[PDB]
């Protein structure tokens, strides 16, 4: 068969930068190696296939190279519309079977910024529904891992909570991260105080922000 | 069975482009008895100066024939990817009783390229590819021709400097302008002036290789290769079916100049042969490598009464068809090629 | 079997003869079972006719193309339909098994042809040669 | 000029037999190979299955042996692709697409591109599901104005919705500063979640009102959620 792994998964790439994603070729039987450009919510566009073409509307600085065992991608002024995830998947003759691709998407180099937490209170029609879902929002922090514990009356809470990362603005590129929680009417009541406890590389210091039932 | 060789390294097949329109020409190529182009010479018989009449499979006199040729895949002028042939896998011919071709008579005279009319080129003799099956039947594609149980396919090899013979069960393959794969136009063969018929170098196994990329070869009964003469000069090639074997004849193994038929090879095949296809074969070339190609007439063998005469070096130079003409009918009357003014009834 | 299978050419002189292998000789492989073809047929577009097919002198049966090299049964039935091109229809083809008998016994066909005036299948071994100035001379094509 | 539609895609049972389309629209599907790849969410696209232009021979991936059965039709324009017991883990985005052999012949340094991978297939998504249950929209109110301090965010959470297409808005649109939409999440449960959220002004809080708008398209229900 064929296995394929990409060594940088993410590539943290600034404006104008020039970076080179690296891919493994199972086998040095079959010479087509091809590359794949793909932007999300979109069909995948061709950059090369026997690796001696360049596709049409593909600028020189994108270029693939294959040495021994391992092909790389090389680009060159990169912009934010050229970053997008990249797929690339050996071609066999004698394997009717397309590799799959891991996907590398490049995030943007930019300067960091502090994370800004904001806390929703469960919905009245929520709770009347059944189920109680306090909503915490962490907004403008630049660094694309961040780490949220969620803790109800100072106990750890694991399951319940599920973080949810928005889509990067084109030009803002800001980050928000959404953190939904499912609980039943009796366990609203039985958890007094909920609290967002913070932890991100651009903090120095981790943060909680906490309350209990009933403000308004 | 006999082992066929390396198998196609290319699971997708090269792609074929059709232009019969181009390929299509307009000339004269009269078979004459007088002449004796295209009459066979009997190996059983042997004669002296005196004329006689003998029985033979012969082509009628006047007949035209099938014109095939061959022409250069459409190609970039730094790289030659597309196979050009005419629709002749789809044109399927019955082997009621085999067939005579002629070879190298465009050859020696200057003539248009087949693929482009403006461009001009001195014509270059080429040697036909036959293949013969007792049955053909259409592919899954629905391009006539793939027999699949055809049992009897010869091609050039080297660029035709040697001939190769060899009766194998097709194997349809799955890939690109395969019979049976994706996208499939027609089955081809590519020679390259360039590299396989580069003076010094020729390569039998490139023309095997494009063959085995459309069919694989498996049961092969025998494997066949004659070496022969390649020359810039008219030649007949005769093939025909008899009980006791398959037989293939050829005027260059024994008098090129002649024209006389002379058995060359003995194929050891008893099954009965209904179909035959004719000028499968494609160039592969750069624009300029193009030149003007001769091309294959096929004539077919019927049984015929002929009037033969024998000159003293014993080869025939003149024969006379008792079947075409009321005056050539009078001629085989009497064995005489001149017969006396008369008032004479005919049928 | 003859009319179906194999036909000797009654023009050229022929011999035909039944011969058994020597149990000791080795060189000979035992064929599953003896197989003939019982009958061959073409069954026509309509398929209400069918029509007969006889082997030519030294020719292979179209129906011997589908049977395979030893039959499976006896009153086997192969059904092959033609292509368009070959104008369609059916092909019927009924094989019939003879058990091996515990000597092979082969049929041995013989063909002489003097069609060919140059040709020199010799028997064994001056007399032989030029020096005769005389009379006969046993040539291939004639003594 | 090549348009490549598919239609068939829709939510199905586990287990129950679906059926998808492709269509060519100034096409040559009769002489062009198809080739079938499947996106699943936060995965690259996979090849799942290969439809010959001859049609003689069709080959699927070693994942799926006989469930998937693809069938090319010429005079109809149409390739049919059959699926059955499906799972919510086969739940994925299936695009047909045409792809061209690339073959070089070297006579003399020479290289042809030989390509023709354009008008990729756009694809339809599938989701493999049942019990579907109705959407409910829940407006987010903050606890006190001084929890907020320095930035404000008006946000609604959409829970418990088994349709895919919903579409969410503030203010009818009106509000487009600082909009961050989440992408659906799939619990124990399989119910989709989704959250919208808009920055606004933290001095115009209480005395400026934020009413959300919400409309699902199977529905064609536009709830305000107001606070």
């Known amino acids: 068969d064929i296995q394929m792994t990409q060594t940088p998964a993410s590539l943290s790439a600034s404006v104008g930068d020039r970076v080179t994603i690296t891919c493994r070729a199972s086998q040095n039987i079959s010479s087509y190696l091809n590359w794949y450009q793909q932007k999300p919510g979109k069909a995948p566009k061709v950059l090369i296939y026997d690796t001696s073409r360049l596709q049409s509307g593909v600028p020189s600085r994108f270029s693939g190279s294959a040495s021994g065992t391992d092909f790389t991608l090389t680009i060159s002024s990169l912009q934010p519309e050229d970053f997008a995830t990249y797929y690339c998947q050996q071609s066999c003759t004698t394997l009717r079977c397309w590799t799959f691709g891991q996907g590398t998407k490049l995030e943007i180099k930019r300067t960091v910024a502090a994370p800004s937490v904001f806390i929703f209170p469960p919905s009245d029609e929520q709770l009347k529904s059944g189920t109680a879902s306090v909503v915490c929002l962490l907004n403008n922090f630049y660094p694309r891992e961040a780490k949220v514990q969620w803790k109800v009356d100072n106990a750890l809470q694991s399951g319940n909570s599920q973080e949810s990362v928005t889509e990067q603005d084109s030009k803002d590129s800001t980050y928000s991260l959404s953190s939904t929680l499912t609980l039943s009417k009796a366990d609203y009541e039985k958890h007094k105080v909920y609290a967002c406890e913070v932890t991100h590389q651009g903090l120095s210091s981790p943060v909680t922000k906490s309350f209990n039932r009933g403000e308004c | 069975y006999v082992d066929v060789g390396p198998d196609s390294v290319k699971s997708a097949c090269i792609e074929v482009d059709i232009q019969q329109t181009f390929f299509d020409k307009t000339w004269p190529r009269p078979i004459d008895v007088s002449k004796a182009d295209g009459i066979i010479y009997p190996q059983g018989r042997t004669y002296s100066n005196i004329t006689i009449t003998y029985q033979g499979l012969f082509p009628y006199q006047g007949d035209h024939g099938d014109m095939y040729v061959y022409s250069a895949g459409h190609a970039t002028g730094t790289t030659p990817q597309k196979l050009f042939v005419a629709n002749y896998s789809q044109d399927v011919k019955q082997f009621a009783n085999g067939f005579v071709v002629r070879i190298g008579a465009a050859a020696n005279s200057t003539g248009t390229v087949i693929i482009s009319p403006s461009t001009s080129a001195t014509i270059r003799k080429i040697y036909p590819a036959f293949m013969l099956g007792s049955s053909v039947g259409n592919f899954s594609d629905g391009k006539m021709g793939r027999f699949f149980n055809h049992t009897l396919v010869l091609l050039p090899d080297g660029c035709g400097t040697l001939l190769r013979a060899f009766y194998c069960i097709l194997e349809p393959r799955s890939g690109n302008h395969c019979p049976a794969g994706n996208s499939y136009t027609s089955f081809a063969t590519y020679h390259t002036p360039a590299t396989d018929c580069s003076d010094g170098n020729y390569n039998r196994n490139a023309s095997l290789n494009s063959f085995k990329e459309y069919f694989n070869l498996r049961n092969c009964t025998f494997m066949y290769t004659y070496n022969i003469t390649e020359d810039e000069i008219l030649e007949w090639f005769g093939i025909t079916q008899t009980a006791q074997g398959v037989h293939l004849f050829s005027s260059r193994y024994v008098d090129l100049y002649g024209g006389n038929m002379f058995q060359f090879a003995t194929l050891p095949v008893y099954d009965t042969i209904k179909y035959y296809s004719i000028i499968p074969h494609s160039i592969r070339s750069i624009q300029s490598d193009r030149k003007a190609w001769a091309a294959f007439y096929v004539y077919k063998l019927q049984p015929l009464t002929f009037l033969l005469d024998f000159s003293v070096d014993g080869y025939i130079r003149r024969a006379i068809d008792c079947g075409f003409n009321d005056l050539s009918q009078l001629h085989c009357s009497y064995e005489s090629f001149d017969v006396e003014s008369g008032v004479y009834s005919v049928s | ?143 | 000029e090549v348009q490549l539609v598919e239609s068939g895609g829709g939510v199905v049972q586990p287990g129950r037999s679906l059926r998808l389309s492709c269509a060519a629209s100034a096409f040559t599907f009769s002489n062009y190979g198809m080739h079938w790849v499947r996106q699943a969410p936060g995965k690259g696209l996979e090849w799942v299955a290969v439809i010959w232009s001859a049609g003689s021979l069709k080959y699927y991936a070693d994942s799926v042996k006989g469930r998937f059965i693809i069938s090319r039709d010429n005079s109809k324009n149409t390739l049919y692709l059959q699926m059955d017991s499906l799972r919510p883990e086969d739940t994925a985005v299936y695009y047909c697409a045409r792809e061209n052999t690339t073959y070089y012949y070297e006579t003399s340094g020479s290289w042809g591109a030989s390509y023709y991978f354009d008008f990729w297939g756009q694809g339809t998504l599938v989701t493999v599901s049942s019990s579907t249950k109705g959407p409910s929209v829940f407006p987010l109110a903050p606890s006190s104005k001084s929890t907020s301090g320095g930035t404000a965010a008006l946000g609604c959470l959409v829970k418990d919705y088994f349709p895919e297409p919903v579409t969410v808005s503030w203010n009818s649109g009106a509000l487009t500063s600082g909009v961050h939409t989440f992408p659906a999440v799939l619990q124990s449960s399989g119910l989709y979640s989704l959250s919208s959220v808009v920055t606004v002004p933290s001095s115009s809080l209480g005395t400026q009102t934020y009413i959300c708008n919400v409309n699902h398209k199977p529905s064609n229900t536009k709830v305000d959620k107001r606070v």
């Open chain 3, 1 to 143: 079997i003859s009319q179906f299978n194999y036909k000797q050419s009654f023009s050229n002189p022929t011999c035909l003869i039944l011969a058994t292998v020597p149990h000791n000789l080795t060189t000979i492989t035992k064929p599953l079972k003896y197989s003939y073809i019982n009958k061959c047929s073409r069954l026509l577009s309509d398929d209400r006719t069918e029509v007969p097919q006889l082997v030519n002198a030294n020719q292979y049966s179209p129906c011997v193309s589908i049977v395979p090299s030893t039959v499976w049964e006896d009153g086997d039935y192969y059904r092959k339909q033609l292509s368009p091109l070959e104008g369609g229809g059916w092909l019927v083809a009924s094989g019939s098994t003879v058990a091996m008998t515990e000597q092979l016994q082969m049929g041995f066909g013989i063909t002489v042809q003097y069609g060919t005036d140059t040709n020199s299948v010799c028997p064994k071994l001056k007399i032989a040669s030029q020096l005769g100035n005389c009379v006969e001379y046993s040539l291939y094509g004639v003594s």
